[PDB]
Amino acid sequence: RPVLVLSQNTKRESGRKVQSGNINAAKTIADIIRTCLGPKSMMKMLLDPMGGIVMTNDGNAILREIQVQHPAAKSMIEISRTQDEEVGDGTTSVIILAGEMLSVAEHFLEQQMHPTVVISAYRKALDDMISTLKKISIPVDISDSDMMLNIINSSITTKAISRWSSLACNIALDAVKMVQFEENGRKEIDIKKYARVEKIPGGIIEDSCVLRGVMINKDVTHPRMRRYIKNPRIVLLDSSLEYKKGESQTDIEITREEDFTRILQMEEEYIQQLCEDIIQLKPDVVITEKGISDLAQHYLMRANITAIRRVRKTDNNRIARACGARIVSRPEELREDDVGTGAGLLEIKKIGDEYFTFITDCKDPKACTILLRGASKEILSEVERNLQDAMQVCRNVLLDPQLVPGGGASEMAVAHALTEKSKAMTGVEQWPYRAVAQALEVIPRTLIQNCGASTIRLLTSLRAKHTQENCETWGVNGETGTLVDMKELGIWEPLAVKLQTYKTAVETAVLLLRIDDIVSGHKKKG
């Protein structure tokens, strides 16, 4: 009975209300984590719908656990995830910057300025921001381990692990250095696959260390195996050491008395032949991604070989990288190059009430296990997140040896540079240009607000100091609320992190400024 052009559940909003709602949603996203930026940030408890509890002050972890209905907030969450994936740091800064730019854009949208003018001004500003950041950067000698440790410390000084700063920095640097690899003229780091972080609740955090090898939560298949081998030769396998059915249907037909016994004996002989093919290379440890039959266990034991089964594929790859082995599927094709020599010790020891396998004395290992021990699961999860941030910062510095001053010094320097450059615009785009340039002051402002000092006088003093000639490194001390040169406080961040943050915030503002109509309620129509 209703004619209807669109579906009755299709709702349309258009006009200024859409822009106002989008900018307000972005500002609300910013306000969610406005107080979680800086060395004096405070933790937040997140109640997972699955029953878990997340306790963190990291921007991405906080934002990811929040379900929102306004799609501008969804865009902001995606922006936070993109910043986390690309560089691993600056997650709160990008959100705050995007909120500030969207606010100052709404300022002009109140007047009769078209959004495209604001977008063009924002893009010009972004180009000049990139130029200014590249200008004020300084080179770094990566061979100086002290500089790398200081960089990692400045990266993790705002997290929970900042108490054990030296330990965390050493762990991250050692892991990144030993995971770095090069083959066939290609240089790679690949922190995601190798450099696994294994956390065991209990103990003390000071006992945490990065292992010179790989540790797994596995035990020997048979009790009479050796749980301590000095210089093992590790052989890695994918195929199981059992007797398996063929792919094709292979029904047998028995009419003679001895054929049943012959079939069973041939099964046993096949297992023995496989075990003998493995034994021929005289290894000490056999690791399999799949099951190992009891008869195979006995045959390996007869040759004094330790066998561990049902190891995950990623763990097997990590072990191969650590001990310099190569995974082999068919034992009859096992060759001497595939035997893993280089592991300096293998030991199965008991932690709490579980057995753990340690391969932890490898010479020149290309994979490592970071053993975390702490108060509980949530504390160790937060420590793991901080360690991930540290390793990502380390790999960013290794790939790009550039640094820029931190603590708001870079923000104020870029803001002053763009403000000075805007004096020659002599057009209509100069106002949005100057507004987005000055929107960078939100980072020092947020640092001062979290420190608890007076925002207005400190920020005015910082601006006045930055108006001088050689003062681009003058930031704000986040834990005392006083102006200080950052070449004395020694807080620096990778140029890649700042560049990615600035680019992502500007692009977020551009994307959200191009929307003036919202249609919702329609079905997927697959």
Binding site: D48, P49, M50, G51, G52, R64, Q67, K74, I77, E78, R81, E85, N217
Partner: protein, 66 residues
Amino acid sequence: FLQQYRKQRMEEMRQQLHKGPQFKQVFEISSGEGFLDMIDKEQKSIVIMVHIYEDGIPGTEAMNGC
């Protein structure tokens, strides 16, 4: 002691890593006509599990997260 579910803990451990782009939510049916017109569509290969629930009663939140 395989029946004690030793692998259960590590199953939860790598089930925690849902995906990259958020984790979405569970679809809600508005009306019985909506239920019918979303149920008669698609093909046989699609398996559908539907949950009836009310607010406040025990057990709904846990299996909803599940």
